[model samples]
Target: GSHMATLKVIGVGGGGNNAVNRMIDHGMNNVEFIAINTDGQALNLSKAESKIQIGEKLTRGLGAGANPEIGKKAAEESREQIEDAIQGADMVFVTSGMGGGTGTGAAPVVAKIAKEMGALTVGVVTRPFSFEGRKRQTQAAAGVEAMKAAVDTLIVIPNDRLLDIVDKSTPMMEAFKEADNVLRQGVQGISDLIAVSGEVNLDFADVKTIMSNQGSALMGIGVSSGENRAVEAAKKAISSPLLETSIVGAQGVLMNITGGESLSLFEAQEAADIVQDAADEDVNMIFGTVINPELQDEIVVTVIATGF
Candidate 1:
């Protein structure tokens, strides 16, 4: 059971579905997107390969109404559907915004089911806004603990952080879009690794070695072009606000450098060194390079540093 073969992205609730839809609109290729929720209305709003509505009897195609227990029960009642949803995938990404019923309870359940079925599972969850109340924050925290136990690596983003990075004038929908973009960068980078072979390849075994046993992870992505592309991208990635720069005691770091056919070995090595220098000397590192002709002179760096 290796990764980078088949991949499925499952969006577990309202927030999850919206994020997946944003990715789809971005024209992401190869990987499949499936929207799963208890709300038929929300499911209808999503454009994915398939949509699964759970807890038909319990929620009556409505929603969990912010009760995680109901969400858990709905998923349990539809276990078979959950199982079927993730079938035939080498890797699974379960995404949702924690705090709400469907996202909080069912997201972990879905990730657990995927893991049980032998797929490498990654949970990408978002915490609530500051204005969302302490109850929602508490619920989100509980959901994160559940997901941590269920998945190989979890990427949790606090929505409140968006206020600092994004403009206050940015519409509510757009602020959420920024979060979705971060998720896209990490997940799409992984999809690129599996779909395209590189000169210095980061194989599935290496991914498992770095990702597995790592409590949770912080993912960062950077892009640069022209001269010194690798070093520039590395600096941006290392200083990325989305990824907590303080995760120095990490178990391992997985990095990918993508560039055009003109990418040189010297540049790739330089990028790898920059990332390593930014971390503890003892931390394990796995670096991969992708010669993406489409990128031309541009170089893209993606990092998934695991274990807090």
Candidate 2:
């Protein structure tokens, strides 16, 4: 049997629920999924392990109507239910799309709940597109600041950035599909990092050290086959535009190597060096390696660099 993390991925509100649904549809498994929303109608459409409708008195199944204050009140009213749903999680990811009421108002509360429960809480969220209006943009910014205070790390992607990544000809659904693909891979990569049983490991503590903070995170992944694959993969992982564009005052770095029995000490060292190359000289670098027979002679590198 494969070893895995005792983690939960939670979706708060409409956009968040949609993202989690996409993850499940695309075959993410081995952990629990919970969807929390003020709208009973929207909860009915989610495909998560648990569906929680908060603020029965306030929203009454209608929704927060893009009002953050109403969303906050609803969450406060249903805090008990939310806590119970995430009670036993070793780590919790609070995901949302900020702009409207439920996501904007409720996400911070949920992050606070998860963190209070002693979980390594992280927030994965999306900011609204430029044309969505200045009102939404302002609300989203406020939501992100609140979320940062409650969670260890917050990875926010601007929806407008997705526009730059996909072709102008791409349909709206396809653009979202591309963005969701990147987001899901990141979620899956963390799952792989924590779940692998190995000689060297990135245990919960190590994760907390590198990850917990109201700072920025740069994550990249790469894979290669045969000789010098480890070094090449490591270099590619950090060099990827996803990490490169976001590089800041790096405070720490964590590298996870997944390879088969053929993994060598030399390869591991070389890989680590290449990965650390992008980090500041004053920063700390930590690493772990896992053996996966399926990888054969191929090595997959996952690099997460964080900054102040």
Candidate 3:
């Protein structure tokens, strides 16, 4: 029997639910989106394929009141449903905004369950902005540590980084939307690597090999056109401001180059080589190329560096 790889993106908590919503709005292919929250009003608003309201009895369909302990208990109370949601997934991306009750408390629990169910689990979370106060920052740090232990690859996007890219006059909601776009791109990049076939193909096994048990990961995507597209795209991807650290010491790298029919094999290889030069000498580098007819002279480079 032929087997199809299944991917699940589970959003836990209010911020997580909003993240999932953003992904859905941007469009993803062949992935299941599940919204899990302790708040019923928020859960009802999710565009995810499935919605699970956890800890209904404990919180009476309300939120966890910004208490991580309560969020943890809520996930514990609804363990069975979570297990069922994750049962057959080959890969799971758990996304949330850390420091809040459900995201801080429930995300790790959800990642743990996904791993226990034999999925290659990756966690993509956002840390609170400094202005959010010491308390939220403290809780976010703890949540990041907890999630690090629970998933194969953990990607943390600090909200403070927004200050570096966006103007001070930018609206708060627009800034948050930017963060959500980063989360969506990270997930989209990995998903495209496994789902889209190219001249050099990457399967689920390749992804699992590079990502499984890896402590932390970095992601970046760059798109460009014209004669210098390959170099410019690779440079942009490698220099993504959302990435927390440098790729100099990464143990493994997975890169996918997408371009139109005009894209030459030389161009693709050049992009791959540029990324490899930034990583360690012995880094295990895997790259593939996808030709999209709609892309014309444009090139899109997506890089995922792991094993920090």
Candidate 4:
């Protein structure tokens, strides 16, 4: 019997929970979503398939009050429960918004447990906006450090990067919504690369080879429809706002191109070549193509560059 790859996505704390909610709403197949938090109220509102509330006794489900110590204790207090939720998965993705108490404190603990369980663990987290204040920024930097040590691949998306993509006149809520969309796309890209079977398929081994134990990863997706859609899509992808630095020095790149039935091999190859040219000459680049009838004339390119 062929084994189906299992992926467990754990959203830790408020920001993480919101991300999970958006993913659920957007819809993906064969992946289990879990929400872990210290606040009962927030957990109750989550759309994840499973929910685990930590620090119930200590915090009385009142949340960590923006205190990392409380968030850490909450996770420690419920370590076994978190373990149970994460066990038996082939891959684990921990998504959180750094700088807050629960996400800052509990996310690392959750990632550590996932890694210890022998799963390929990845962390996708967002740093606070610059205007959120220096205290939050300091806390987020520390959180990033802890997460780097815990997960196999860590993707950090600084919220301030939104400034580069959005106009100053954009509403604050809309800006955050855009950030959440970016997080959702990043997670979806990785999951689809491994799970979805395409004209050129990427199996679990392909994903593991490029991602496992790789530090500091960047993910981006570009969509376009035109005569030169492939090149346009690739250009947009490499310039994703989630990128903290250039991919010029990346050691490996895993790119997936999805297009309509009309998509030709030349177009797909062109998109891959563009991404390859952006990275180091010796970079190990793996690419796949998926033909989606629903896409019609549109082309979507998703890239994950690692080991930077």
Q: What is the lDDT of residue 282 in candidate 4?
A: 72
Judged by lDDT relative to the true structure, which candidate is superior, 1 or 2?
1
Q: Which segments of candidate 4 are over 4 A away from where they belong? A: 260-262, 292-295
Better of 3 and 4 by TM-score: 3
* lDDT of candidate 4 over 52-147, digit per residue (tens): 999999888888888988888899999999999997889898999999999999999999999999888989899999999999999999999999
lDDT of model number 3: 0.87
Model 2 has an lDDT value of 0.81
Q: Report residue 244 deviation for candidate 1 (angstroms).
A: 5.5
Q: lDDT of each structure? A: 0.84, 0.81, 0.87, 0.86
- Candidate with top lDDT is 3
Candidate achieving the largest TM-score:
3
> TM-score: which is higher, 1 or 2?
1
Give candidate 2 misplaced runs (Cα > 4 Å). Answer: 1-5, 226-228, 239-245, 261-267
Q: Please give, for residues 1-308, the per-residue lDDT of candidate 3 as tens digits.
A: 44468989999999899989988988988899999999999999999989999999989999989999888999999999999888889989999889999989999999999999889999989899999999999999999999999999988888889888888698977877877876777777777776677777876777888889998887789999998899889888878676566677887988888998898878877887788788755678877788889888889998888877
- Backbone clashes in model 1: 0
Q: Between the candidate structures 1 and 4, which one is better when assessed by TM-score? A: 1
Residue-level lDDT of model 2, residues 255-287, one tens digit each, is 888888898999999988775555645668778
Error of 3 at 208 (Å): 0.9
Alpha carbon lDDT at 214, candidate 1: 66
